[PDB]
């Protein structure tokens, strides 16, 4: 049960680094994300879809510097890989100023 874990524990960062190239190809391609959560502007956590892996089956995150960057390479990536509406996956801004 990954319901008993430490809640009071500061989010360590978010999990594991991976590179972007990564991310299309074992993640993203695969449908197995449901949202990319853009935390504090800093770096991206790669949400998996809730049945996959929990919160101790220990997400993905990349650094992306430049915002703007990101996204001109997600919305590309999405019509090279043939994603419509359905396939679009949620960009969620995210800046908490605690971090």
Sequence with gaps: ???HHHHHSHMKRSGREI???DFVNNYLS???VDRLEVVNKRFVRVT???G???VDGQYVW???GSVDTFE???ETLQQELGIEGENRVPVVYIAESDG
């Design 48 to 50: 998996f879809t809730p």
């Design 62 to 64: 990349f650094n992306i």
């Design 52 to 54: 996959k892996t929990p």
């Design 1 to 3: 049960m990954g319901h």
């Design 30 to 32: 695969k449908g197995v």
């Design 19 to 21: 590179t972007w190239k």
């Design 72 to 74: 001109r390479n997600l």
